[PDB]
Swiss-Prot record, chains A, B:
The keyword Cytoplasm applies. The lineage of its organism: Eukaryota, Viridiplantae, Streptophyta, Embryophyta, Tracheophyta. Pathway: Amino-acid degradation; L-phenylalanine degradation; acetoacetate and fumarate from L-phenylalanine: step 3/6; Cofactor biosynthesis; prenylquinone biosynthesis. Residues 12-158, 183-335 form the VOC domain. It comes from Arabidopsis thaliana. The gene is HPD. Fe cation binds at residues 186, 260, 346. One of its GO terms (cellular component) is cytoplasm. This is 4-hydroxyphenylpyruvate dioxygenase.
């Protein structure tokens, strides 16, 4: 059931912004590890005396990396005279965020029809304001409300190239890397209490709960009208045999925040081949692969969707598979992206639900909790 | 002239430590960009609840990258019960350093015969103490005095594997990258006033001034007894036509600090081939190359040291060449390593002064100031 209750018109995920101590090194690491090209910049070379911001793209996926300069460079500015290209940026907020949480997502940005309206309607319906609507070069409007922890939900709307004040990156510095990643599928938050977090976010967005089908979590998913914006939220379950890794997240992150970004690939086999080639030469590492019993058990579960060779290809790459009532999911998870056991990345490709593919086809992999345990005990043998 | 006036026995450069906001991403970027292997770690997985520290090595060159965890992880510890492997580390100092300066060098570490003696003699001769001598596992002693700005000169001495509490990195995570870099040749600081900085450092070390042979700087070089530890220092020259980039450094860095690290290569052609292949895929960028007139003029200057093809190879890679009375220098410079126009890297190889090669053979390239200007005006033509 989908009541289509959005309180304002939402389009798609637009970008994800990381707050960094040094944007250059994080962006260069992520570019090589994920196959994303350098697409836009706003920094000293474009007249921005406030923050360094670098944009990576792969298909429609947009990762923004931002770090503050010395405040002394902009000490004479006021907001009316700012050289910052992102008017919501604040040196103190950024330093406090990074000192508190380490490297992580500050903003989950969605494109909307009218960011000013989205902001006003959100706040009228309980959203905590974070940055008011600001019109950039009479062309783009940006606004921000609190999502959870120190993560903001950012609204961007365009009258008609990322943001005014950003410059497209010279061809020489823009190597055309591409490992097949094409868009953000979903963005997941960890909170201490799922109930109040859901009530808050669904309260100000009108997002509805997305249909689903001992491991230390309870989760639910909020979705926009066409279910293309997907915001799962997890809470820890206490007193379990193994300590909840949602709780470990909350401790190491100093509270609620973004747990993982799931990136859709148009060819998850190619994406994982390319990412795994680079794991130990600057890229990303992956979680340990499931035992062979897991891939033996895939025959019974998805033998009508994947051939033997395609299943063997999943085994070679450590890819997980899940299925719900409408579709099939291929997924795999990275180790944490930085020093802390907090944020990680999921790579996903979905099979089925063709009408374009409908959002969330195959679910989010909750069936793999039981299938992994069963596989581990069976391989124990 | 070399008076050999060291006040304590100094051996070689031992390591350089960067203070980071996220050590993982900087280390992975540097590893790929410079061809350095992951060699040791001290972090949550080794029982360190205080800081994440990752060691990269190439030959004898050792780069350490360190970032603080949440203080809450170690809030019950005191110094007698610390789980930090580097006892001089302090969360507040590290966060303050990185917020003030951005990514940069905190420690220039030299191996000495007796770090406790080196510390005591240094302080008795004017050194400002930063961290007292601490004996680690009855095997290594570490001590720190202020060098310039917030950079410390770190003394390490071994009774007899980086530091106790560090673990060697698993083979799978340790890809054997190598682009030919073999050791730290020299480490250069920028200060507002060269005179007082030289008097201070030479005062507490006994290091002597190293023999040399409009551009915005005055510089001098301090050297140990065998001139293998080399510490140049620059000050800005004001009122020049082009603003001194020493002064730009001081402004963007919020004061004095480490300007560049010069890394000796055993094959600078191979090093530059490998680094330039990776510039736009996560590695380091290089300064713009000199005009062809510069390489035409190399015939007269070093035609007795390099063949035509070797000179042409220099031109293909943008390598600079200088010569003093004893030897010849090949050098090239990266663009800044991070967001701020502050720290950069030099790659160097020296030709001559064979007895082993004596330290500083060929100088530091000061002749390239005039040779570059002349080349630029001649190519203007
Ligand atoms: O989990 C949820 C809730 C719903 C919205 C969401 O998108 C997801 C996932 O993406 C997801 C689903 C199933 C699995 C999985 C991730 N993971 C990674 C992993 C390890 C550990 C823990 C934790 F310790 F926190 F419980 C959670 C996740 C696997 O390794 C195979 S099972
Ligand atoms: O400079 C010094 C002093 C002595 C100890 C030292 O090791 C060095 C060098 O390594 C060195 C020497 C000559 C050159 C050079 C670097 N560089 C980079 C560069 C650009 C700009 C400015 C500045 F703007 F600050 F003046 C300084 C340096 C070149 O590009 C070719 S000339
Ligand atoms: Co997921
Ligand atoms: Co130099």
């Amino acid at each position: 059931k989908n009541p289509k209750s959005d309180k304002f018109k939402v389009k798609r995920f637009h970008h994800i912004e990381f707050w960094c101590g040094d944007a250059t090194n994080v962006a260069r690491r992520f570019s090589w590890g994920l196959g994303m090209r350098f697409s836009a910049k706003s920094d000293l070379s474009t007249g921005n005396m406030v923050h360094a911001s670098y944009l990576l793209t792969s298909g429609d996926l947009r990762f923004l990396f931002t770090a503050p300069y010395s405040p002394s460079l902009s000490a004479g500015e006021i907001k009316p005279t700012t050289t910052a290209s992102i008017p919501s940026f604040d040196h103190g907020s950024c330093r406090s965020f990074f000192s508190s949480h380490g490297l992580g997502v500050r903003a989950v940005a969605i494109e909307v029809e009218d960011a000013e309206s989205a902001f006003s309607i959100s706040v009228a319906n309980g959203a905590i304001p974070s940055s008011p609507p600001i019109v950039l070069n009479e062309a783009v409007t940006i606004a921000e409300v609190k999502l959870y922890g120190d993560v903001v939900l950012r609204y961007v709307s365009y009258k008609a190239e990322f943001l005014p004040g950003f410059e497209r990156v010279e061809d020489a510095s823009s190597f055309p890397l591409d490992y097949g990643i094409r868009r953000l599928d979903h963005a997941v938050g960890n909170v201490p209490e799922l109930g109040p977090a859901l009530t808050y976010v669904a309260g100000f967005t009108g997002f509805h709960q997305f249909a689903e089908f001992e491991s230390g979590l309870n989760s639910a998913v909020l979705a926009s009208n066409d279910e293309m914006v997907l915001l799962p939220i997890n809470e820890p379950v206490h007193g379990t045999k193994r300590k909840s890794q949602i709780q470990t997240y909350l401790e190491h992150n100093e509270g609620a925040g973004l747990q993982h970004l799931a990136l859709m690939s148009e060819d998850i086999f190619r994406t994982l081949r390319e990412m795994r080639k680079r794991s130990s030469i600057g890229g990303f590492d992956f979680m340990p692969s499931p035992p062979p019993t897991y891939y033996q058990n895939l025959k019974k579960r998805v033998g009508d969707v994947l051939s033997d060779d395609q299943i063997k290809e999943c085994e070679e790459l450590g890819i997980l598979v899940d299925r719900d009532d409408q579709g099939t999911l291929l997924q795999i998870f990275t180790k944490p992206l930085g020093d802390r056991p907090t944020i990680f990345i999921e790579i996903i490709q979905r099979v089925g639900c063709m009408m374009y593919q409908s959002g969330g086809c195959g679910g989010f992999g909750k069936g793999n909790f039981s299938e992994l345990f069963k596989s581990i005990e069976e391989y124990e043998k």
